[PDB]
mmCIF file of N, CA and C in Angstrom:
data_model
loop_
_atom_site.group_PDB
_atom_site.id
_atom_site.type_symbol
_atom_site.label_atom_id
_atom_site.label_comp_id
_atom_site.label_asym_id
_atom_site.label_seq_id
_atom_site.Cartn_x
_atom_site.Cartn_y
_atom_site.Cartn_z
ATOM 1 N N UNK X 1 -81.128 109.996 117.827
ATOM 2 C CA UNK X 1 -80.870 108.925 116.842
ATOM 3 C C UNK X 1 -80.742 109.483 115.470
ATOM 4 N N UNK X 2 -80.694 108.611 114.460
ATOM 5 C CA UNK X 2 -80.492 109.042 113.093
ATOM 6 C C UNK X 2 -81.638 109.864 112.593
ATOM 7 N N UNK X 3 -82.860 109.667 113.071
ATOM 8 C CA UNK X 3 -83.970 110.567 112.627
ATOM 9 C C UNK X 3 -83.627 111.986 113.038
ATOM 10 N N UNK X 4 -83.187 112.181 114.251
ATOM 11 C CA UNK X 4 -82.907 113.532 114.721
ATOM 12 C C UNK X 4 -81.782 114.180 113.923
ATOM 13 N N UNK X 5 -80.806 113.372 113.541
ATOM 14 C CA UNK X 5 -79.732 113.890 112.698
ATOM 15 C C UNK X 5 -80.249 114.248 111.317
ATOM 16 N N UNK X 6 -80.996 113.335 110.718
ATOM 17 C CA UNK X 6 -81.423 113.495 109.355
ATOM 18 C C UNK X 6 -82.411 114.627 109.150
ATOM 19 N N UNK X 7 -83.140 114.974 110.198
ATOM 20 C CA UNK X 7 -84.136 116.050 110.125
ATOM 21 C C UNK X 7 -83.734 117.321 110.894
ATOM 22 N N UNK X 8 -82.473 117.433 111.296
ATOM 23 C CA UNK X 8 -81.953 118.646 111.885
ATOM 24 C C UNK X 8 -82.787 119.073 113.097
ATOM 25 N N UNK X 9 -83.198 118.120 113.904
ATOM 26 C CA UNK X 9 -84.193 118.426 114.920
ATOM 27 C C UNK X 9 -83.673 119.403 115.946
ATOM 28 N N UNK X 10 -82.442 119.176 116.448
ATOM 29 C CA UNK X 10 -81.977 120.036 117.519
ATOM 30 C C UNK X 10 -81.803 121.490 117.047
ATOM 31 N N UNK X 11 -81.329 121.679 115.837
ATOM 32 C CA UNK X 11 -81.231 123.023 115.263
ATOM 33 C C UNK X 11 -82.589 123.680 115.169
ATOM 34 N N UNK X 12 -83.549 122.931 114.682
ATOM 35 C CA UNK X 12 -84.908 123.441 114.479
ATOM 36 C C UNK X 12 -85.592 123.757 115.808
ATOM 37 N N UNK X 13 -85.426 122.879 116.776
ATOM 38 C CA UNK X 13 -86.008 123.098 118.083
ATOM 39 C C UNK X 13 -85.442 124.368 118.711
ATOM 40 N N UNK X 14 -84.125 124.532 118.621
ATOM 41 C CA UNK X 14 -83.478 125.694 119.136
ATOM 42 C C UNK X 14 -83.991 126.975 118.493
ATOM 43 N N UNK X 15 -84.141 126.952 117.185
ATOM 44 C CA UNK X 15 -84.656 128.147 116.541
ATOM 45 C C UNK X 15 -86.095 128.466 116.932
ATOM 46 N N UNK X 16 -86.928 127.458 117.052
ATOM 47 C CA UNK X 16 -88.283 127.665 117.527
ATOM 48 C C UNK X 16 -88.313 128.311 118.904
ATOM 49 N N UNK X 17 -87.462 127.793 119.766
ATOM 50 C CA UNK X 17 -87.417 128.327 121.141
ATOM 51 C C UNK X 17 -86.982 129.785 121.137
ATOM 52 N N UNK X 18 -86.031 130.148 120.247
ATOM 53 C CA UNK X 18 -85.615 131.534 120.198
ATOM 54 C C UNK X 18 -86.786 132.429 119.774
ATOM 55 N N UNK X 19 -87.603 132.021 118.827
ATOM 56 C CA UNK X 19 -88.746 132.824 118.421
ATOM 57 C C UNK X 19 -89.817 132.874 119.502
ATOM 58 N N UNK X 20 -90.170 131.708 120.040
ATOM 59 C CA UNK X 20 -91.257 131.616 120.978
ATOM 60 C C UNK X 20 -90.928 132.337 122.286
ATOM 61 N N UNK X 21 -89.789 132.006 122.874
ATOM 62 C CA UNK X 21 -89.461 132.605 124.165
ATOM 63 C C UNK X 21 -88.847 133.997 124.001
ATOM 64 N N UNK X 22 -88.225 134.261 122.841
ATOM 65 C CA UNK X 22 -87.657 135.582 122.599
ATOM 66 C C UNK X 22 -88.712 136.641 122.338
ATOM 67 N N UNK X 23 -89.834 136.257 121.745
ATOM 68 C CA UNK X 23 -90.923 137.174 121.511
ATOM 69 C C UNK X 23 -91.475 137.683 122.834
ATOM 70 N N UNK C 2 -88.560 104.584 118.155
ATOM 71 C CA UNK C 2 -89.638 103.946 117.422
ATOM 72 C C UNK C 2 -90.221 104.876 116.391
ATOM 73 N N UNK C 3 -90.813 104.349 115.350
ATOM 74 C CA UNK C 3 -91.470 105.174 114.351
ATOM 75 C C UNK C 3 -92.528 106.038 115.026
ATOM 76 N N UNK C 4 -93.206 105.484 116.019
ATOM 77 C CA UNK C 4 -94.240 106.219 116.721
ATOM 78 C C UNK C 4 -93.720 107.488 117.370
ATOM 79 N N UNK C 5 -92.631 107.343 118.115
ATOM 80 C CA UNK C 5 -91.987 108.451 118.797
ATOM 81 C C UNK C 5 -91.544 109.444 117.763
ATOM 82 N N UNK C 6 -90.959 108.914 116.693
ATOM 83 C CA UNK C 6 -90.393 109.772 115.712
ATOM 84 C C UNK C 6 -91.455 110.518 114.949
ATOM 85 N N UNK C 7 -92.556 109.887 114.614
ATOM 86 C CA UNK C 7 -93.649 110.570 113.953
ATOM 87 C C UNK C 7 -94.226 111.662 114.846
ATOM 88 N N UNK C 8 -94.334 111.388 116.153
ATOM 89 C CA UNK C 8 -94.841 112.377 117.105
ATOM 90 C C UNK C 8 -93.934 113.606 117.123
ATOM 91 N N UNK C 9 -92.643 113.347 117.237
ATOM 92 C CA UNK C 9 -91.694 114.435 117.275
ATOM 93 C C UNK C 9 -91.800 115.312 116.022
ATOM 94 N N UNK C 10 -91.774 114.655 114.868
ATOM 95 C CA UNK C 10 -91.768 115.380 113.604
ATOM 96 C C UNK C 10 -93.094 116.136 113.349
ATOM 97 N N UNK C 11 -94.243 115.491 113.668
ATOM 98 C CA UNK C 11 -95.501 116.181 113.489
ATOM 99 C C UNK C 11 -95.556 117.408 114.393
ATOM 100 N N UNK C 12 -95.156 117.239 115.632
ATOM 101 C CA UNK C 12 -95.289 118.328 116.614
ATOM 102 C C UNK C 12 -94.361 119.467 116.253
ATOM 103 N N UNK C 13 -93.117 119.126 115.933
ATOM 104 C CA UNK C 13 -92.154 120.158 115.534
ATOM 105 C C UNK C 13 -92.599 120.886 114.276
ATOM 106 N N UNK C 14 -92.982 120.164 113.267
ATOM 107 C CA UNK C 14 -93.357 120.739 111.989
ATOM 108 C C UNK C 14 -94.604 121.638 112.083
ATOM 109 N N UNK C 15 -95.590 121.181 112.879
ATOM 110 C CA UNK C 15 -96.768 121.989 113.098
ATOM 111 C C UNK C 15 -96.465 123.266 113.837
ATOM 112 N N UNK C 16 -95.561 123.230 114.824
ATOM 113 C CA UNK C 16 -95.151 124.445 115.502
ATOM 114 C C UNK C 16 -94.453 125.409 114.559
ATOM 115 N N UNK C 17 -93.601 124.876 113.676
ATOM 116 C CA UNK C 17 -92.946 125.693 112.670
ATOM 117 C C UNK C 17 -93.971 126.377 111.768
ATOM 118 N N UNK C 18 -94.976 125.652 111.316
ATOM 119 C CA UNK C 18 -95.977 126.232 110.491
ATOM 120 C C UNK C 18 -96.735 127.352 111.228
ATOM 121 N N UNK C 19 -97.060 127.113 112.500
ATOM 122 C CA UNK C 19 -97.718 128.099 113.317
ATOM 123 C C UNK C 19 -96.875 129.344 113.537
ATOM 124 N N UNK C 20 -95.653 129.162 113.944
ATOM 125 C CA UNK C 20 -94.812 130.267 114.353
ATOM 126 C C UNK C 20 -94.253 131.027 113.149
ATOM 127 N N UNK C 21 -93.856 130.308 112.105
ATOM 128 C CA UNK C 21 -93.231 130.898 110.915
ATOM 129 C C UNK C 21 -94.238 131.103 109.780
ATOM 130 N N UNK C 22 -95.256 130.299 109.654
ATOM 131 C CA UNK C 22 -96.270 130.456 108.621
ATOM 132 C C UNK C 22 -95.708 130.399 107.218
ATOM 133 N N UNK W 5 -82.280 111.089 124.740
ATOM 134 C CA UNK W 5 -82.191 112.335 123.955
ATOM 135 C C UNK W 5 -83.526 112.697 123.297
ATOM 136 N N UNK W 6 -84.176 111.687 122.727
ATOM 137 C CA UNK W 6 -85.537 111.892 122.183
ATOM 138 C C UNK W 6 -86.426 112.378 123.298
ATOM 139 N N UNK W 7 -86.106 112.080 124.548
ATOM 140 C CA UNK W 7 -86.901 112.594 125.696
ATOM 141 C C UNK W 7 -86.660 114.073 125.993
ATOM 142 N N UNK W 8 -85.412 114.549 125.818
ATOM 143 C CA UNK W 8 -85.190 115.989 125.943
ATOM 144 C C UNK W 8 -85.961 116.701 124.828
ATOM 145 N N UNK W 9 -86.002 116.108 123.659
ATOM 146 C CA UNK W 9 -86.783 116.669 122.560
ATOM 147 C C UNK W 9 -88.281 116.727 122.892
ATOM 148 N N UNK W 10 -88.849 115.629 123.377
ATOM 149 C CA UNK W 10 -90.289 115.583 123.730
ATOM 150 C C UNK W 10 -90.612 116.621 124.810
ATOM 151 N N UNK W 11 -89.718 116.704 125.813
ATOM 152 C CA UNK W 11 -89.927 117.670 126.903
ATOM 153 C C UNK W 11 -89.936 119.086 126.359
ATOM 154 N N UNK W 12 -88.993 119.382 125.494
ATOM 155 C CA UNK W 12 -88.905 120.718 124.895
ATOM 156 C C UNK W 12 -90.113 121.008 124.065
ATOM 157 N N UNK W 13 -90.615 120.001 123.318
ATOM 158 C CA UNK W 13 -91.817 120.195 122.548
ATOM 159 C C UNK W 13 -93.048 120.482 123.425
ATOM 160 N N UNK W 14 -93.210 119.748 124.498
ATOM 161 C CA UNK W 14 -94.323 119.943 125.389
ATOM 162 C C UNK W 14 -94.249 121.367 126.017
ATOM 163 N N UNK W 15 -93.034 121.808 126.383
ATOM 164 C CA UNK W 15 -92.839 123.130 126.929
ATOM 165 C C UNK W 15 -93.173 124.202 125.906
ATOM 166 N N UNK W 16 -92.735 124.023 124.665
ATOM 167 C CA UNK W 16 -93.056 124.969 123.613
ATOM 168 C C UNK W 16 -94.590 125.108 123.444
ATOM 169 N N UNK W 17 -95.246 123.937 123.367
ATOM 170 C CA UNK W 17 -96.663 123.906 123.160
ATOM 171 C C UNK W 17 -97.408 124.607 124.302
ATOM 172 N N UNK W 18 -96.982 124.348 125.534
ATOM 173 C CA UNK W 18 -97.612 125.014 126.678
ATOM 174 C C UNK W 18 -97.394 126.513 126.625
ATOM 175 N N UNK W 19 -96.192 126.949 126.299
ATOM 176 C CA UNK W 19 -95.910 128.381 126.245
ATOM 177 C C UNK W 19 -96.703 129.067 125.155
ATOM 178 N N UNK W 20 -96.854 128.459 124.003
ATOM 179 C CA UNK W 20 -97.605 129.078 122.920
ATOM 180 C C UNK W 20 -99.107 129.035 123.228
ATOM 181 N N UNK W 21 -99.663 127.882 123.618
ATOM 182 C CA UNK W 21 -101.100 127.711 123.624
ATOM 183 C C UNK W 21 -101.729 127.619 125.021
ATOM 184 N N UNK W 22 -100.942 127.397 126.047
ATOM 185 C CA UNK W 22 -101.520 127.341 127.391
ATOM 186 C C UNK W 22 -102.012 128.717 127.867
ATOM 187 N N UNK W 23 -103.065 128.764 128.645
ATOM 188 C CA UNK W 23 -103.564 130.009 129.182
ATOM 189 C C UNK W 23 -102.550 130.663 130.101
ATOM 190 N N UNK W 24 -102.342 131.965 129.939
ATOM 191 C CA UNK W 24 -101.501 132.701 130.867
ATOM 192 C C UNK W 24 -102.163 133.009 132.187
ATOM 193 N N UNK W 25 -103.432 132.628 132.332
ATOM 194 C CA UNK W 25 -104.141 132.785 133.613
ATOM 195 C C UNK W 25 -103.811 131.663 134.588
ATOM 196 N N UNK W 26 -103.089 130.637 134.134
ATOM 197 C CA UNK W 26 -102.739 129.506 134.949
ATOM 198 C C UNK W 26 -101.314 129.623 135.473
ATOM 199 N N UNK W 27 -101.150 129.659 136.797
ATOM 200 C CA UNK W 27 -99.857 129.754 137.413
ATOM 201 C C UNK W 27 -99.069 128.448 137.256
#
């Protein structure tokens, strides 16, 4: 929804995953 | 809902603080 | 879509904080 758009949620989730699972 | 959205944002933001500091 | 987000958050949290002794 618009919250996810306005807060860049998918981008941020993806980056977290890269750090967490990449480590 | 605001509830779902607050949960998402709190959880995401806290993980960012933890992982990135 | 908010559900894919919630699922990914729960998975992240488990990976970071869950015990690695649990299969």
